[PDB]
């Protein structure tokens, strides 16, 4: 048959990201001595709206500690930040909302966000709206600490991985029911080309494996092995279970 | 009523293609090319439109007299009068507190 819609998605055609009005890459600043063995102070100049993402972005401004000028950064807002607030980033920073601390200095039970999976990689985990990761325990024997990811999974990271103390702003975004197809159309203004999704059973046998006959149905089980080739991998993949959960 | 025509070769109602119809000798109407509306300066901190500076194109500020493109004050073209009073108080008060708290407490 044809190449299904999932195959056509990996080619980088019209399915490219609609990132033209985006503000930029949101991350911590690059690690240095003044962050490893001191604290640098940042000023939250403004809080802006980055298209395509649900959380506001803070236009933080630091001072260059080795040369003359400014280090205009772009952080992800923690809930409660306000314009003109001072935020301190470093190993000796105080445990306040918005401060950037290595994950080893946070007491067990601290709620953090924008955590680095690897030291110095400028933020990976807990970046969506209203999300956060909790610190579970420390292990000074091998300099590793345990955190609980927003998916519930537990992850062990190095004790010098940085994080922002608090909650990502914009929580409760997905609790408001979209009511109209027009509203969902505007949701993907700064996203990829995915929205109007035709059911595979409404397709033809050439287009999709579900492309059916005289009655709209599937015909074969929709739970498939992980090793299925691209093209026939349509439906539920490696499904340990199905049906409504109890 | 006298109807007019575009004088330049642009034929679309674009932002730079603004025209004005004015009357002339004999009742004829001619077409002028009018100028876009610009914005002024804003305080570097509070983002308020500064007073005393015209709202013209960036290059026309060069034609203006030296005194008409700024205000005679500290920072005088980048900060409002309120924006500067805060700057002076912050500098003096914090240095004074840094003088009494530390530095022979």
């Amino acid at each position: 048959g044809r190449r299904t819609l999932s195959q056509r998605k990996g080619r980088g055609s019209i399915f490219k990201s609609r990132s033209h009005h985006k503000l930029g890459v949101a991350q911590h600043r690059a690690i240095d001595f003044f962050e490893r063995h001191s604290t640098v102070r940042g000023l939250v100049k403004s809080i802006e709206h980055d298209p395509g993402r649900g959380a506001p972005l803070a236009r933080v401004v630091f001072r260059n500690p080795r040369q003359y000028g400014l280090d205009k950064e772009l952080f992800i807002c923690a809930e409660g930040l306000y314009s003109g607030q001072y935020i301190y980033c470093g190993s000796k920073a105080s445990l306040h909302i918005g401060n950037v601390l290595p994950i080893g200095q946070c007491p067990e039970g601290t709620v953090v966000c924008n955590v680095e999976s690897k030291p110095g990689d400028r933020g990976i985990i807990a970046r969506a709206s209203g999300n956060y990761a909790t610190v579970i325990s420390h292990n000074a024997d091998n300099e590793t600490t345990r955190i609980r990811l927003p998916s519930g999974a537990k992850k062990t990271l190095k004790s010098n991985c940085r994080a922002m103390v608090g909650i990502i702003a914009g929580g409760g975004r997905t609790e408001k029911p979209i009511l109209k197809a027009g509203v969902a159309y505007r949701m993907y203004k700064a996203k990829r080309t995915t929205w109007p999704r035709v059911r595979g059973v409404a397709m033809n046998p050439v287009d999709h494996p579900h492309g059916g006959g005289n009655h709209q149905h599937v015909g074969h089980p929709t739970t498939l092995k992980r090793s299925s080739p691209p093209g026939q991998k349509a439906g539920k993949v490696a499904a340990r279970r199905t049906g409504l959960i109890r | 009523a006298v109807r007019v025509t575009y004088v330049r070769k642009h034929s679309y109602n674009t932002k730079s293609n603004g025209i004005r119809i004015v009357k002339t000798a004999g009742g004829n109407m001619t077409v002028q090319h009018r100028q876009k509306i610009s914005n002024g300066v804003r305080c570097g901190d509070c983002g308020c439109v500064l007073a005393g500076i015209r709202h013209i194109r960036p290059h026309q500020y060069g034609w203006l007299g030296k005194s008409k493109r700024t205000v005679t004050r500290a920072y005088g073209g980048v900060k409002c009068h309120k924006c500067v009073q805060k700057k002076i108080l912050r500098a003096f008060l914090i240095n004074e507190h840094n003088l009494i708290k530390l530095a022979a407490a």
């Binding site: 403004s46 809080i47 802006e48 709206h49 649900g54 959380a55 506001p56 803070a58 807002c77 923690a78 809930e79 409660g80 930040l81 306000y82 314009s83 003109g84 105080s94 445990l95 306040h96 909302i97 007491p107 039970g109 601290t110 709620v111 709206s129 209203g130 956060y132 103390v165 608090g166 909650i167 702003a169 914009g170 929580g171 409760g172 975004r173 609790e175 408001k176 029911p177 009511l179 | 509070c46």
Partner: protein, 90 residues
């Protein structure tokens, strides 16, 4: 004016009684003014999803999608204060 459909009368009769009920609570809380934590004025209005601006005070605050401060965002702030005091004291 209306018996019970207060703000969701603009949706007419075409989205479902339950969905119009759920969207009503959110749309009231999204459009209302909140007490502004730095100057104690009912002058904070939402400017974007998660950005709130004190009208008569000149401050921009990051908050919830539709409410200035979320329930989960308030317990976390309280929790950190307890953790910080305990760390600062022994």
């Amino acid at each position: 004016r209306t018996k019970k459909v207060g703000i969701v009368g603009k949706y007419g009769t075409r989205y479902g009684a339950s969905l119009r009920k759920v969207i009503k609570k959110i749309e009231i809380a999204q459009h209302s003014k909140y007490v502004c934590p730095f100057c104690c004025k009912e002058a904070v209005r939402r400017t974007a999803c998660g950005i709130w601006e004190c009208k008569g005070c000149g401050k921009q605050i990051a908050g919830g999608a539709y409410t200035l401060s979320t329930i989960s965002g308030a317990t976390v702030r309280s929790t950190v204060r307890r953790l910080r005091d305990a760390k600062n004291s022994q």
